[PDB]
Write a protein that binds this DNA or RNA. Structure first.
Lengths: 155, 156
RNA sequence: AAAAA
């Protein structure tokens, strides 16, 4: 059979990975993951609309001494194939730079961006992560006081 | 090592899928998908919070002659494992009930629910779909008029 | 809030 199999699904990581690749829609959630994981390497995949947010994340990362790859851009946030291709490129680029353990944080972007990132993570044998939060009812944004680093799959 | 040989594309057919399983957050998108695919069977996975919306979808479907399975429930929308288990059961239940071509619509529910549904679809060799819209910047809502059925993955 | 909004 050629059918895919997911032997380890779910769970929580509360720190390890030294590299993280993000799909990007906002800057605050990747900045939180950066503070939790303290990676030495970072990859970023964004859209035209979220490019500025991704550049804000990279600017904070560089001032902490993190090696940043990207932001790479996808032309269509609805297309899972473009996000798969760009995340797979960054995972390869991080590995060729010496990065060992890498995770893909697929929280940001539209669902096809996250699903393409997941497929690229699975094809590379790397873990996929998701930042679970409750919604801040009074500030109308994710409540990062509630943030938990959940694990989607560990190949 | 998993591999995804067929990723992306656009789907336009009222006869390709006999059944659709939804992860549920709202009733509007599943009702749109029902109209487009016109399935004979439907499965539904919900949380305690989205159970009422899933029941609204089921009620509409029953009155159109669709055989509805579920809603099954997951305790936590942030955990992929429960959604994966419940979608896997529904895919099996639909196959046992006579449904030969099933899709999983990933659009609804929290992202971990969708990711669990994707993993169950892949393990069952069934296709995953997404309802793409452009943002209706006038109403600050997804623009349902722009809705197109996207293919996420088509397992071999 | 759970269709990047």
């Amino acid at each position: 059979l050629t059918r895919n199999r997911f032997p380890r699904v779910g769970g929580v990581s509360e720190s390890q990975w030294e590299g993280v690749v993000f799909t990007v829609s906002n800057e605050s959630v990747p900045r939180w993951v950066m503070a939790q994981i303290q990676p030495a390497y970072m990859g970023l995949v964004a859209t035209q609309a979220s490019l500025a947010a991704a550049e804000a994340v990279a600017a904070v990362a560089r001032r902490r001494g993190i090696e940043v790859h990207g932001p790479l851009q996808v032309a269509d946030p609805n297309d899972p194939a473009a996000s798969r291709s760009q995340v797979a490129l960054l995972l390869s680029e991080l590995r060729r730079a010496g990065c060992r353990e890498i995770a893909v944080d697929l929280t940001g972007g539209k669902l096809p961006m996250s699903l393409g990132a997941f497929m690229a993570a699975e094809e590379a044998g790397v873990a996929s992560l998701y930042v679970a939060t409750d919604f801040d009812k009074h500030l109308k944004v994710p409540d990062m006081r509630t943030a938990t680093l959940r694990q989607i799959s560990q190949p």
